[PDB]
Every structure is written in C-alpha cells, then in structure tokens.
Design goal:
This is part of a larger assembly, with chains A and B.
Chain A (H helix, E strand, L loop, with lengths): L16 H10 L1 H11 L21
Chain B lengths: L29 H38 L2
The complex binds 1,2-Distearoyl-sn-glycerophosphoethanolamine.
1,2-Distearoyl-sn-glycerophosphoethanolamine (3PE) binds next to α1 of chain A.
PDB class: oxidoreductase
Keywords: NADH:ubiquinone, oxidoreductase, complex I, mammalian, mitochondrial
Entry title: Entire ovine respiratory complex I
C-alpha cells in the first residue's frame, strides 16, 4: 500500500516557528545531531590486517 | 532419517523495522533563553573587568605624570 512522506503540514503557528528560527539560526540539529553522531567515533573500527589476519570465507 | 532444512521454531522473535528519530526536548525558544543568558553574563563580567582596567590606566598615567618634571 502507499505510505507517503514529505506530505505534511509545516506549522506556521507559534511554538513551531519558534524552534524554526532557533533551528535555522542556531544550528542545534546540525551541531547536536551530526557532530555527536560522529562523536560516535569511539566504537572500535572494523579493520583487519591482511598479511597477519584474513576475513571469513565459506566451504 | 529426518530433514535438515532450516526453519526453526516459529517467528525468530519480533523485529522492529519502523523509523525512530526522537528525544530533543531542550528546544523551545528557551535555547535562546540560555544563550542570550550567557551573553547577559558576559557583558556583566566584562563590564567589571574593563572598569578595573581603566582604574589601572589612570594609575599608570599618574606614574608618568608624577615622573614628568
Ligand atoms: C539583550 C541585548 C541584545 C542581545 C542580542 C542577541 C541576539 C542573538 C540572536 C542570534 C545571534 C546569531 C546566531 C548565529 C547566526 C549565524 C548566521 C546564521 O544565522 O546563519 C544561518 C544560515 C541559514 O541558512 P539558510 O536557511 O540557507 O539561509 C537563509 C537565507 N534566506 O546559514 C546556515 O544555517 C548554514 C551555515 C552552515 C555552516 C557550515 C556548518 C558549520 C558547523 C559548525 C558550526 C559551529 C561552530 C562553533 C564554533 C567552534 C569553536 C569556535
């Protein structure tokens, strides 16, 4: 069935547009969301040393 | 014998497909309230420190002018 996105009413009512001037102006979503979800850095990366280690295979 | 094809006891437990992107509550205008607040602190303290530095300024000019003769 059809479940569609981006068809929504952006509220020009107050308390939405507050956070819209805050949003455009202060970059909170950009900063918090992105910079933090990269600050997700600390997870142990996945890398394998090919001479000394080898990836999985199948019979 | 029996058959070794895969399917286990049914269902594999539940799975969650649907989208989730929640949780930012600090944002009313009140974000402005805390930032503008921080300004309101900065101008206070900096005001004080510039006054002090003027006091020192006069004191130094007093050193010089007492020297002049
Ligand atoms: C009480 C006495 C009076 C007090 C008065 C105080 C008033 C305070 C009011 C707010 C003050 C200003 C706040 C900051 C404004 C900076 C400029 C700005 O608003 O840029 C937003 C602008 C919007 O983009 P767009 O929508 O495309 O443009 C609209 C054009 N019609 O552009 C953007 O959003 C895009 C910019 C993206 C830049 C690249 C990404 C940068 C990511 C890192 C940013 C953070 C870095 C922080 C600093 C690091 C350490 C120094």
């Amino acid at each position: 069935t059809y479940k569609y996105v981006n068809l929504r009413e952006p509220s020009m009512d107050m308390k939405s547009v507050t956070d819209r001037a805050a949003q455009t102006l202060l970059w909170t979503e950009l900063i918090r969301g992105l910079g933090m979800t990269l600050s997700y850095l600390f997870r142990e990366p996945a890398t394998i040393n090919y001479p000394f280690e080898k990836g999985p295979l199948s019979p | 014998k029996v058959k070794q094809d895969m399917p286990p006891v049914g269902g594999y437990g539940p799975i969650d497909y649907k989208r989730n992107l929640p949780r930012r509550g600090l944002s009313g205008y009140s974000m402005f309230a805390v930032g503008i607040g921080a300004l309101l602190f900065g101008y206070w303290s900096m005001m004080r420190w510039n006054r002090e530095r003027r006091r020192l300024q006069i004191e130094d000019f007093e050193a010089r002018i007492a020297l002049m003769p």
